[PDB]
């Protein structure tokens, strides 16, 4: 009749099977982080040249209308 | 014996132990649980996400290409 | 079997383990709440920065015929 | 095993736990770049809008 030891022994297996997936998904999720902070990082120096190439351009056109 | 008193708390030491350590494994597995659940939705979250960057990516090289032609062209109404 | 001491041992361990995995089940709430939270500014990001290409694609098509 | 599970099951999760403290902090740092790029893009849309304007009204004058 000895259950409680038993489940306590069950429920350590179950957990530390689940640290594993645990594991598994935070070393996805910091390589991914990784991976996305790098492209926002192009995208940044992206958006920046793009901002300066409209603001000279709308500058430009203003200079011929009116 | 006098000890009998004794005796029967140490037994009921024993058994509030074991029972508090069966019950903390059993809040753990919930913890863990939730914690999976964090996760997963973490990683679908970070998945779709990285679909919109790439589109953001593609819409600043798209808006770079654009740019430089708009720019030929404004040089060129000029003069 | 098993004296009080070893038992006892035992409990102290687990609280220690259980202690532990709320650390680690923080850390995976607020992951999630922060990434979320990020989705939100990013969804911006993805419909102003479709929209400028829009807005560019047709200004530049616009230069083109100003130049004919 | 009782004694054994414990203590593997402890440095199971004290690596979890180094790994996504690390996380946090990349996640973090995510967090600023992407609030920044938040308010560019809005501004960079913005100005396209003006832009699309003024080609739009040399178009209109040249064409
Ligand atoms: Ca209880
Ligand atoms: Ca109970
Ligand atoms: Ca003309």
Redesign the interface.
Known sequence: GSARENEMDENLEQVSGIIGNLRHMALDMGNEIDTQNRQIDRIMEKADSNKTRIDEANQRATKMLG | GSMRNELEEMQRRADQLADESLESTRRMLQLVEESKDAGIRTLVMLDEQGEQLDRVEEGMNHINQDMKEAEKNLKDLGK | GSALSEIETRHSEIIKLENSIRELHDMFMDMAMLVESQGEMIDRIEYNVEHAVDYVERAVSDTKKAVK | ???R??????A??????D??????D??????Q??????D??????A??????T??????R???
């Open positions: 095993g009782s004694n599970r414990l203590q593997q099951t402890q199971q999760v004290d690596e979890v736990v790994i996504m403290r690390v996380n946090v990349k996640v973090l740092e995510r967090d770049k992407l609030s920044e790029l938040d560019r893009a809005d501004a960079l849309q100005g396209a809008s003006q832009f699309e003024s080609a739009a009204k040399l178009k004058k040249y064409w």
